[PDB]
Amino acid sequence: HWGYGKHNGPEHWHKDFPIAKGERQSPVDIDTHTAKYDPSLKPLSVSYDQATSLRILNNGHSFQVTFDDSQDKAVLKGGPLDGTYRLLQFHFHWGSLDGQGSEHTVDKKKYAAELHLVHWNTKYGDVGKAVQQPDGLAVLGIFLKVGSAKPGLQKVVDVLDSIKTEGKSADFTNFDPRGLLPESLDYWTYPGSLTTPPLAECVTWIVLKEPISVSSEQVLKFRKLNFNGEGEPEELMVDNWRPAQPLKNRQIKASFK
Ligand SMILES: NS(=O)(=O)c1ccc(-c2cccc(C=O)c2)cc1
Numbered sequence: 128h129w130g131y132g133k134h135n136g137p138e139h140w141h142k143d144f145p146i147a148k149g150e151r152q153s154p155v156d157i158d159t160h161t162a163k164y165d166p167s168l169k170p171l172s173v174s175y176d177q178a179t180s181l182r183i184l185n186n187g188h189s190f191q192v193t194f195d196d197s198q199d200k201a202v203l204k205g206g207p208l209d210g211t212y213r214l215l216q217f218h219f220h221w222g223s224l225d226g227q228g229s230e231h232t233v234d235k236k237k238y239a240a241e242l243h244l245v246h247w248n249t250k251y252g253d254v255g256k257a258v259q260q261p262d263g264l265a266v267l268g269i270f271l272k273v274g275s276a277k278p279g280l281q282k283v284v285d286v287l288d289s290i291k292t293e294g295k296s297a298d299f300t301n302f303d304p305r306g307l308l309p310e311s312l313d314y315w316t317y318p319g320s321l322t323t324p325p326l327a328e329c330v331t332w333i334v335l336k337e338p339i340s341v342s343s344e345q346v347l348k349f350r351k352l353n354f355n356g357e358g359e360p361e362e363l364m365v366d367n368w369r370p371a372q373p374l375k376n377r378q379i380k381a382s383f384k
């Protein structure tokens with residue numbers, strides 16, 4: 128199946144998912160000097176006060192924290208978005224070393240990791256329907272650099288030993304994703320895609336300019352996860368990022384001057 132290795136990695140995905148070579152693929156390099164400030168972008172609204180986390184899961188490509196999306200509890204609105212988008216899950220992409228791991232890049236700079244908070248447009252009723260629409264999903268992307276620890280990440284890090292291998296999950300209730308956000312909500316936005324198969328062109332990307340800092344100990348715990356299932360040859364879950372794709376006929380807009 129698809130993965131991040133030499134024989135099943137991003138350069139192979141187009142064979143099973145031809146949209147991999149499409150017109151609005153993600154991630155992209157964000158050229159900060161070419162992105163244009165758009166004074167018409169309304170303010171971004173992150174309303175996570177009523178979030179209900181459910182489970183944490185190793186899916187063989189990342190780990191994810193899942194939320195109750197059966198009501199408007201944790202929602203993203205405003206910015207470039209029309210309507211209301213419910214938080215379904217968050218997950219990360221990271222590297223084998225601190226100089227790579229992010230999917231988006233900024234003036235070709237790679238960060239150590241990237242957090243994706245995945246939301247779907249309630250006008251389509253369920254996420255499966257939303258993935259079939261050009262404005263079905265909104266992903267809030269946040270860069271991670273290594274320095275000081277992020278206290279709001281520690282509860283995640285401390286349960287990873289319980290989901291080491293593909294297929295494992297654990298209860299992960301009462302987690303507050305507000306603890307993963309930087310101070311500023313300044314952002315870049317563009318129309319793109321899922322960065323893992325099926326690579327559907329259904330995402331409004333909102334990438335925050337301000338990274339969060341995490342400690343070396345925190346990212347080291349990400350790197351102890353396994354791509355493999357229990358009993359199979361151990362292959363560390365590292366470098367689970369897709370590289371930047373061609374921008375093609377798109378403009379990246381900035382919310383800030
Ligand atoms: N990495 S990312 O662009 O944030 C991302 C977010 C959500 C998905 C997703 C959504 C729904 C179904 C599936 C798999 O069938 C994948 C896939 C990729």
Ligand SMILES: [Zn+2]
Pocket residue numbers: 218219220243322
């Ligand atoms: Zn992702």
